[PDB]
């Protein structure tokens, strides 16, 4: 819901961690696209140590280039998704907001470059691209091209040239305590299978009455029987 979105050549990367991510609010301007690569979009009960939201403004016909193993103007030189992407390319038309006539030159894309982008590499540099033997001398000229070129959005164009805002969520998993657990409700007072982040068991879960100190995440009785457990998502004993 930010007022303005980053150009495709300087995409942002708002790291998200240590919160509860409700993925339902994202469902909603009509989401002409909501794809996911690696995880099933339909109904959020996994825990990731980091969520990276890369947000930008790409034209409509190039929303199809935000996809693993795809090539063209956007995926090669501006924003390169890896071959094993795990996340969800969300997009939606924004012809009302991002298509003024005072803000023609707010959205630029990288038309020239010497090699494809290493996955998740951002280049803001604006070095005059040299496409000839003679040196450019730092001033644009014949066979010396300035890379960034402007979309110059207009409100009267098609639905294939209108600013489709885009957000790419990548979910990442290290050997560190995962904290982005976004709410599964589980029944109490009745025999029920429980799977607490791989802690699998069967039993009756009840409102605990023992005082775990804040550094304790389990509970053992005599003879090492698991007597109490805390939820790694909502922290309930």
């Amino acid at each position, epitope marked *: 819901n930010a007022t303005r979105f980053a150009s495709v050549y300087a995409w942002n990367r708002k790291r998200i961690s240590n919160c509860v991510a409700d993925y339902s609010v994202l469902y909603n301007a009509p989401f002409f696209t909501f794809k996911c690569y690696g995880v099933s979009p339909t109904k959020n009960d996994l825990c990731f140590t980091n969520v990276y939201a890369d947000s930008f403004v790409i034209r409509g*016909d190039e929303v199809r280039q935000i996809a693993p193993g795809q*090539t*063209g*103007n956007i995926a*090669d*030189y501006n924003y390169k998704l890896p071959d094993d992407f795990t996340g969800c390319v969300i997009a939606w038309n924004s012809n009302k907001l991002d298509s003024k006539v005072s803000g023609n030159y707010n959205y630029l894309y990288r*038309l*020239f*470059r*010497k*090699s*494809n982008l290493k996955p998740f590499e951002r280049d803001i540099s604006t070095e005059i*691209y*040299q*496409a*000839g*033997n003679k040196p450019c001398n730092g001033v644009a000229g014949f*066979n010396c*091209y300035f890379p960034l*070129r402007s979309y110059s959005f207009r409100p009267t*164009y*098609g639905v*294939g*040239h209108q600013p489709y805002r885009v957000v790419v969520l990548s979910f990442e998993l290290l050997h560190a305590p995962a904290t982005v657990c976004g709410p599964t409700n589980l029944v109490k007072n009745k025999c029920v299978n429980f799977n607490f982040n791989g802690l699998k068991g069967t039993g009756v879960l009840t409102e605990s009455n023992k005082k775990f100190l804040p550094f304790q995440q389990f509970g053992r009785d005599i003879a090492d029987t698991t007597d109490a457990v805390r939820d790694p998502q909502t922290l309930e004993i």
Partner: antibody
Amino acid sequence: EVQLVESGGGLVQPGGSLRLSCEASEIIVNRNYMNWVRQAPGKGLEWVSIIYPGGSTFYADSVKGRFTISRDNSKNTMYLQMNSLRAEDTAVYYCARSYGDFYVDFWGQGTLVTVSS
Amino acid sequence: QSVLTQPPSVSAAPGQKVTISCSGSSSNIGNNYVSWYQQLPGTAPKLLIYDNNKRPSGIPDRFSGSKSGTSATLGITGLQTGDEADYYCGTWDSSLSAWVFGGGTKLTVL
């Protein structure tokens, strides 16, 4: 002076194989987006293939799979590997530099190609 | 099916402005940029107009290019003898992911 000169054109039998080549001077083929376009006698330029700075290739519908475009490492020259020809590949292939995807700035002279016995 | 349509021929006498219209489906010419090329006999296409209106590198003047909706228009004030060539219109059809060219007009001076 800027110039692109192409060779490799002559008579060939159906199903043959050729290596047409595009030689670039004053310009550097390993950077500017280069394109192979064709025009059968009495016909219209038809896009055959475009090579991007980053190595990516695009080919037309009729010319898919059989063909291949390639960019030399050091010779400053590009090549089309034409394979599995038919009657509709009679042409005067041209190689042309295309700023981005917008317009084709420089055109080579022309290299006839014939598919007959 | 997108391939821009162009009249088979256009003819005018010298001193009379010549208009050429390239029309195509709004998949490629309504969302991308036209460009206009000139092919003199027995030669190679020479870029004439680019980016929907511009005139590059000092092309002989009075050559004009415009874009109206899903159509593009080329204009030459008068019909000079030297201008006789074939004229083509090209756009990057993203649906086909391919450059698409027009039929080509045989400009003949009356």
